[PDB]
Ligand binder design. Structure first.
Ligand SMILES: [Zn+2]
Lengths: 108, 58
């Protein structure tokens, strides 16, 4: 039960329950709205202001953050599949509690 | 022949709303539907929320 597998399962559940906000604009709106318990970041993105703003907003809202490696893999996980490639995700809510969610909380 | 409007694509528009301590440069719309997430447009003479068409002249 690796943290990668836990993230994949929780993202799949959130998408199936429509609790996922993909993209930097949607993620920023969800974070500023005092919602969206968790956030996922991709280390592949080459834009420095991107990661700077993502981390600054996440820290200001005081919510968990995860830095995954590949933007394309993150997009394929969040369900943009040819994969567009998501470089920042937000979990507005989880559909149902699961062992993957528990593992993510423990990693937090 | 009348030409159709073409949207001017802006790259990483959200990057222009925040400065990194964080600072929200664009004013937020004070409406029940919009809230803090939605930002108000800063035109040369007015603030204009896109979502609810709320306009505050200078
Ligand atoms: Zn508004």
């Amino acid at each position: 039960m690796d943290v990668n597998t836990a993230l994949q399962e929780v993202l799949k559940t959130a998408l199936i329950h429509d609790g996922l906000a993909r993209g930097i604009r949607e993620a920023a709106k969800a974070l500023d709205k005092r919602q969206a318990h968790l956030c996922v970041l991709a280390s592949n993105c080459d834009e420095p202001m991107y990661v700077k703003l993502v981390e600054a907003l996440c820290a200001e809202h005081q919510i968990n953050l995860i830095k995954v490696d590949d933007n394309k893999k993150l997009g394929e996980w969040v369900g943009l599949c040819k994969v567009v490639g998501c470089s920042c995700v937000v979990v507005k809510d989880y559909g149902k509690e699961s062992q993957a969610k528990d593992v993510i909380e423990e990693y937090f | 022949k009348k030409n159709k409007h073409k949207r001017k694509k802006v790259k990483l528009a959200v990057l222009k709303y925040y400065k990194v301590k964080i600072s929200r440069l664009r004013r937020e719309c004070p409406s029940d539907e919009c809230g803090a997430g939605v930002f108000m447009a800063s035109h040369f003479d007015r603030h204009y929320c896109g979502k609810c068409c709320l306009t505050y002249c200078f």
